[PDB]
């Protein structure tokens, strides 16, 4: 007929049956628009299959889902056509599912035979699985004939529709089953310890002298004297040459040796103390082990080792003022200015996000911690976490004693401040940007021992520790890649500009990484549903404009266009794999799910809807009867030839000898041309 029913979306082009020139004008618009939609569906179904790949990340259970993903155009078109057109069986949906089987079984398999490189074969390793699955796919189209012609002919019942749908879970369970199981003595005077240790700031060191043995009811006279070791008398210790007397009944005496303190860094030094001239008042007593002690001097005059407490600090943005601690760890002697500053990174300073600060904090003597006050400024907006940096500079030992200002060889102007430290007048360096009367200032302007003293005293300089750089972090792209990839050799330019509208439109699909592939899955299946709503309309109005039947336009055009996703899936598995299971199984898996979901769901919805109205669901069997029997007769020939290529002369289903490779491909293309030509004639009652 030349009269066009109104589609789901597209309105009827009016007036109807206008002329002969206008039919050519209208059908060209409908054909080019339909071919452009087929180009769009292949792009979005490729992305739909890639999302399924990510969700399930080569098994039969994984491949039956990929065969399900590429069959969405056939499955959705049959469901949309029934529900869109008031639950009435239309020719376009069932025929593009039966017509897809011919294209899948013959044309796709013929192409998979040929794409395998010359000299290489692809053999079905798992032949038991192939027999069961291929029989089930061919039975799907035989069972379609049964419900239309054998059991209650011309009508689809509720149980017929549901039983068609419930064969789909049988495909799912068999896939899971196949992976698990089908695939698989006189008195003596001596020291207590013999080696004492004291700090430099103690002032006195406590040694102990013990008399034991003989008779304790006697008097013992002994002398002690301190002699220089690596520490020198008058500079490091106080010289003492006292006398120790032991009363009768007394066994111990405490002697104290003074330690002269200063502020100069020194290494560990020691001195020797000796006892002799043991005498008794009124052989009897003599010195024994030990009689000489080595007393160490630990020196605490190191001016500090300056570090931040920790590398990374996490700060709430709505905070008034930070207090970063700068720790003077390894000692303290004299005031030491330590410059600091703020370095802005992501958290740009200048007052907008923090108040820029820099200055010269000054430690005092014997003060091991000070704080740096930087104030974060919060903002209303919710933004990304921002960072900025805090760094201290090289310290300066500003204040020192008189004699330590010679060892350090400071030649700047000096001030005599009031304070006294370890009994010595204490000077402080003049710093620029401060002004003296300039009468007040003193300017303080080798023997192989003095140079040693300078070298050791230059190890008490203020230095920087482990962490001199502290990061302050404030606390409250794949989309772009798709659009850059969307828009980017003459043949490539033709294909790029043809599909640039589709690639930019489908770059709004969420990237597959989100929601573990599900964000891409929901949006892709919606767009596939939208573009097969248009294809159902464009193919419907194309046929009635030129008088072509919906049976013919579905078999030739719509069936070929919706199997483009299936063709590339099988072609890649034919070449890249080692066997022919995945390539052929995608054809078999597609054919089964086309009937069980495409016709099973669509005719379940229609039969139930008419049953609620107490009415039968009538599908005319004659158009579909000859198509499904022509397919099964042609399918056994295809399956028979595939099994015949298992001989060692050929070696496998795919590839093989080049002369046999063309004959198998040309035969299967011939079977498809014979199918679509005979089916077109039977549609038009030419037998």
């Amino acid at each position, epitope marked *: 007929s030349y009269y066009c029913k109104k589609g789901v979306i597209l309105p009827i082009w009016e007036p109807q049956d206008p002329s002969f020139g206008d039919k050519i004008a209208r059908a060209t618009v409908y054909f080019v628009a339909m071919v452009y939609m087929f180009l769009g569906v292949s792009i979005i179904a490729d992305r739909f299959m890639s999302s399924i790949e990510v969700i399930t990340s080569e098994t039969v259970s994984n491949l039956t889902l990929m065969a399900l993903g590429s069959s969405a155009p056939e499955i959705l078109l049959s469901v949309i056509e029934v529900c869109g057109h008031n639950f009435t069986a239309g020719d376009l949906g069932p025929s593009t599912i039966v017509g897809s089987a011919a294209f899948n079984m013959f044309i796709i398999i013929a192409l998979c035979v040929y794409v395998v490189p010359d000299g290489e074969t692809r053999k079905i390793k798992h032949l038991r699985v192939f027999f069961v699955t291929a029989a089930w796919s061919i039975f799907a189209y035989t069972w379609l004939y049964i419900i239309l012609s054998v059991i209650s002919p011309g009508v689809v019942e509720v149980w017929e529709g549901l039983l068609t749908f419930f064969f789909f879970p049988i495909c799912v369970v068999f896939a899971w089953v196949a992976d698990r199981r089908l695939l698989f003595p006189v008195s003596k005077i001596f020291f207590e310890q013999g080696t004492y240790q004291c700090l430099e700031n103690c002032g006195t060191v406590a040694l102990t002298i013990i008399r034991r043995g003989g008779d304790l009811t006697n008097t013992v006279f002994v002398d002690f004297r301190t002699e220089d070791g690596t520490a020198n008398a008058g500079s490091d210790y106080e010289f003492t040459e006292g006398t120790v007397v032991f009363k009768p009944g007394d066994t111990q005496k405490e002697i104290r040796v003074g330690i002269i303190d200063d502020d100069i860094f020194e290494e560990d030094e020691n001195f020797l103390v000796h006892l002799s001239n043991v005498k008794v008042s009124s052989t009897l007593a003599c010195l024994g082990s030990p009689s000489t002690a080595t007393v160490t001097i630990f020196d605490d005059d190191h001016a500090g080792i300056f570090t931040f407490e920790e590398p990374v600090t996490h700060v709430s943005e709505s905070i008034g003022i930070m207090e970063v601690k700068v720790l003077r760890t390894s000692g303290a002697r004299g005031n030491v200015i330590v*410059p600091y*500053k703020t*370095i802005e990174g992501t958290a740009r300073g200048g007052g907008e996000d923090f108040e820029d600060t820099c200055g010269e904090l000054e430690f005092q003597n014997d003060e091991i911690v000070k704080t740096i006050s930087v104030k974060v400024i919060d903002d209303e907006e919710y933004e990304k976490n921002k960072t900025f940096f805090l*760094e201290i*500079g*090289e310290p*300066r*030992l*500003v204040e020192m004693s008189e004699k330590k200002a010679l060892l350090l*060889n*400071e*030649l*700047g*102007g000096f001030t005599i401040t009031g304070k006294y430290l370890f009994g010595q007048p204490v000077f402080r*360096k*003049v*710093h*620029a*940007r401060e002004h003296p009367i300039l009468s007040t200032v003193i300017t303080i302007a*080798l023997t192989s021992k003095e*140079e040693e003293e*300078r*070298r050791i005293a230059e190890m008490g300089r203020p*230095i*920087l520790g*482990e962490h*001199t*750089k502290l990061e302050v972090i404030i606390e409250e792209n794949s989309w772009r890649e798709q659009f850059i990839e969307a828009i980017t050799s003459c043949f490539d330019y033709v294909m790029h500009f043809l599909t640039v509208f589709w690639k930019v439109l489908f770059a709004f699909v969420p990237p597959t990484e989100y929601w573990n592939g599900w964000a891409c899955f929901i949006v892709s299946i919606l767009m596939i549903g939208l573009l097969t709503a248009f294809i159902g309309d464009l193919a419907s109005h194309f046929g009635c404009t030129i008088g072509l039947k919906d049976s013919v336009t579905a078999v030739v055009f719509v069936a070929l266009g919706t199997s483009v996703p299936d063709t590339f899936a099988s072609k890649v598995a034919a070449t890249q794999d080692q066997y022919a299971d995945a390539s052929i199984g995608n054809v078999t898996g597609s054919n089964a799910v086309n009937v069980f979901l495409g016709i099973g769901v669509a005719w379940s919805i229609a039969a139930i809807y008419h049953a609620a109205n107490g009415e039968q669901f009538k599908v005319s069997p004659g158009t579909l009867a000859f198509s499904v029997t022509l397919f099964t007769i042609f399918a056994f020939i295809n399956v028979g030839v595939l099994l015949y290529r298992r001989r060692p002369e050929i070696g496998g289903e795919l590839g093989g000898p080049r002369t046999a490779k063309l004959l198998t491909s040309c035969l299967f293309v011939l079977l498809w041309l014979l199918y679509i030509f005979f089916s077109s004639l039977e549609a038009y009652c030419h037998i």
Partner: antibody
Amino acid sequence: QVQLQQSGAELARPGASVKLSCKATGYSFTSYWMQWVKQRPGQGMEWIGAIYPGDVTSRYTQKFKGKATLTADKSSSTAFMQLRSLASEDSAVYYCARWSGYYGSSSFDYWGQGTTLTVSS
Amino acid sequence: QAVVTQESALTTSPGETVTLTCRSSTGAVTTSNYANWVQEKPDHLFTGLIGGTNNRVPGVPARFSGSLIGDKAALTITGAQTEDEAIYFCALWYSNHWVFGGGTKLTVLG
């Protein structure tokens, strides 16, 4: 506009003393360290020391401690290096380099053009 | 006391990437050595490139980048021009005194 004007070429006899002057202009002299670097052809470069012209705080390596004395003159914005007891190995090129005082930044931001010192008789 | 070692010379071509090495004798350079890179142009024109192993001097072109690779410091110039034909020195702090390298006389063909 930071420029460090290094002193002109010097010729001295061995055993004498020479004084070299890096006249720093273009920035805050009394808040930046000045580093002195010795370069000899084939022996790489040797760090002599650093001076802070603010309060005349000085740093030196052990071998250059008695050899070089670093001095500054904040009135005329010039830093000085005095070499004493000159010998044949002191024939080199001496550079002055600006340092902010922070190890996270470059210690050798801006250099002088260098004074060549010739010690021969 | 420690010695810093480099390449004697290392040629490259304009537009190509180049990596310069700086190895300490005591072992691996850490972030506490503060590896500095300076450059001399002919007739004694020195310029400071990189501070504490990452920080770049303002005004130094963005192609110069410093990093740590393995047990040694690295200067990488991505797409060097003819203007980068110079001698590059590396300095290590060693907590008391800067120790310089020998200098790589990088040369670019023209």
